[PDB]
């Protein structure tokens, strides 16, 4: 026999370790076959200037196409013949490259990764070949309402800030982008301490630490002169951006109220809140009996196609809200239920309801961690986000302090009397007037 709590405390702790330059080493052991080693660099889109707005994202197309040591397709051939997978993901705050690989393959794994980060053989040919590709990706991203809309959100809740730029970047910055510019970018932002070398699975921390090729370090200050925040707050703005295209079959709406940085007691309590509203799709098997009202109403009244609440967490900024796709004629009704669910939440939460969401949270936050890749990303990202802690067993505790009154008071900071960030890609003809969505965040009636 064994009980949830117990299991919790029994989980392999994460070992954080440092090289001389600030290279961060972490790892969670299991003595299992496969391993996912990763280098989680934290110089994202938000450091880009208007020109290099898509810089980083451009580097990512070159990351895997050559090192001075390993030319044209020498990287791929190497990974492949091992049976290892190599992925590169980029965010507005975090770039990361990782490898999935047999545990015995660390040797040439970690070498590869390291190599990748540092030496990237980038010829004029590869630059002009990537351009064309990027320009073609851009065109394809315009084919995705959800991606089109979420960008919009950011741009309008971040209007007038570095953070509001697409990670994909400006069309024509791809055309223009000087070859010299990727260098300065990399050179200036890939310098650890930023970087973290993380990993999970069957490895021994001891060896990870050692294996780390100590080749280049943080060429930066020893004092406060550096302390000028490169992470300077980004002004919060509640505006809407309404891009109406009656040509399109459905309507995407992303509505948000600015939120806490990555670390904050209010930041877990929020989650528990969204557990309650939940998320819903044409294909949920419960429909009408699902315990979250927006879902039930939706399910019942054919109100919407799909809807999800989110919590986007940045160091100085946060996007909170949900997002619903709904026929041209149902934009207002779903707005009404949603906002309605928010207000009800900060005034009438009931312990039952908050206790169910609570438990949902736990699961969402345990199940994610199933698999090697998962764990690795939590460990890597966790270190630039929340610093060098791994709050995994704490969570249950913190999640445990949750009370219906805690949930209520935390939700009221952020939603109540606050000014929304709303964007849509019409049929938005029926989308509520900004003032109407505004007055939706306080309770006279409705």
């Amino acid at each position: 026999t064994a009980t949830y709590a117990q299991a919790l405390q029994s989980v392999p702790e994460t070992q954080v370790s440092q090289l001389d330059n600030g290279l961060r080493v972490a790892s969670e052991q299991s003595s299992q076959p496969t391993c996912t080693v990763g280098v989680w660099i934290d110089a994202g889109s938000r450091y880009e200037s208007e020109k290099n707005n898509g810089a980083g994202y451009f580097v990512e197309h070159l990351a895997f196409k050559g090192t001075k040591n390993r030319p044209g397709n020498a990287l791929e051939k190497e990974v492949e013949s091992m049976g290892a997978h190599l992925n590169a993901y980029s965010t507005r705050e975090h770039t990361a490259y990782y490898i999935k690989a047999l545990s015995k393959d660390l040797p040439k794994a970690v070498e590869l990764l390291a190599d990748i980060v540092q030496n990237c053989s980038l010829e004029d040919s590869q630059i002009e070949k990537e351009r064309d590709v990027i320009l073609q990706e851009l065109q394809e991203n315009d084919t995705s309402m959800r991606d089109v809309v979420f960008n919009y959100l950011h741009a309008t809740a971040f209007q007038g800030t570095p953070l509001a730029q697409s990670v994909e970047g400006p069309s024509e910055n791809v055309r223009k982008l000087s070859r010299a510019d990727l260098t300065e970018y990399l050179s200036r932002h890939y310098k650890a301490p930023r970087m973290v070398l993380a990993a999970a699975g069957g490895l021994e921390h001891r060896q990870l630490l050692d294996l780390a090729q100590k080749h280049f370090s943080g060429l930066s200050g020893t004092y406060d002169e550096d302390a000028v925040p490169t992470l300077s707050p980004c002004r919060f703005t509640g505006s809407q951006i309404c891009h109406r295209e009656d040509g399109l079959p459905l309507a995407h709406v992303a509505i948000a109220v600015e939120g806490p940085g990555w670390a904050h007691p209010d930041n877990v309590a929020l989650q528990v809140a969204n557990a309650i509203i939940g998320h819903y799709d044409c294909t949920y098997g419960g429909g009408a009996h699902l315990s979250s009202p927006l879902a039930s109403i939706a399910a019942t009244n054919k109100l919407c196609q799909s809807f999800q609440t989110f919590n986007i967490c940045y160091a100085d900024t946060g996007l909170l809200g949900a997002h619903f796709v709904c026929d041209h004629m149902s934009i207002d009704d779903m707005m009404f239920v949603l906002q309605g669910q928010w207000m009800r939440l900060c005034t009438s939460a009931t312990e039952s309801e908050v206790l169910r969401g609570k438990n949902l949270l736990r699961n969402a936050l345990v199940s994610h961690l199933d698999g090697t890749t998962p764990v690795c990303e939590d460990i890597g990202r966790s270190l630039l986000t929340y610093g060098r802690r791994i709050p995994l067993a704490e969570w249950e505790s913190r999640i445990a302090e949750v009370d219906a009154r805690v949930v209520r008071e935390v939700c009221s900071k952020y939603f109540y009397d606050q000014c929304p960030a709303v964007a849509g890609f019409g049929p938005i003809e029926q989308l509520p007037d900004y003032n109407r969505i505004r007055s939706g965040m306080f309770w006279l009636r409705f």
């Binding site: 005034t347 009438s348 939460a349 009931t350 209520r408």
Partner: peptide
Amino acid sequence: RNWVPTAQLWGAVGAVGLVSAT
């Protein structure tokens, strides 16, 4: 829940209203 404290300030408003207004 919040209804008592809200019903109590709604209570008060009516009262002060009458009192004054009347």
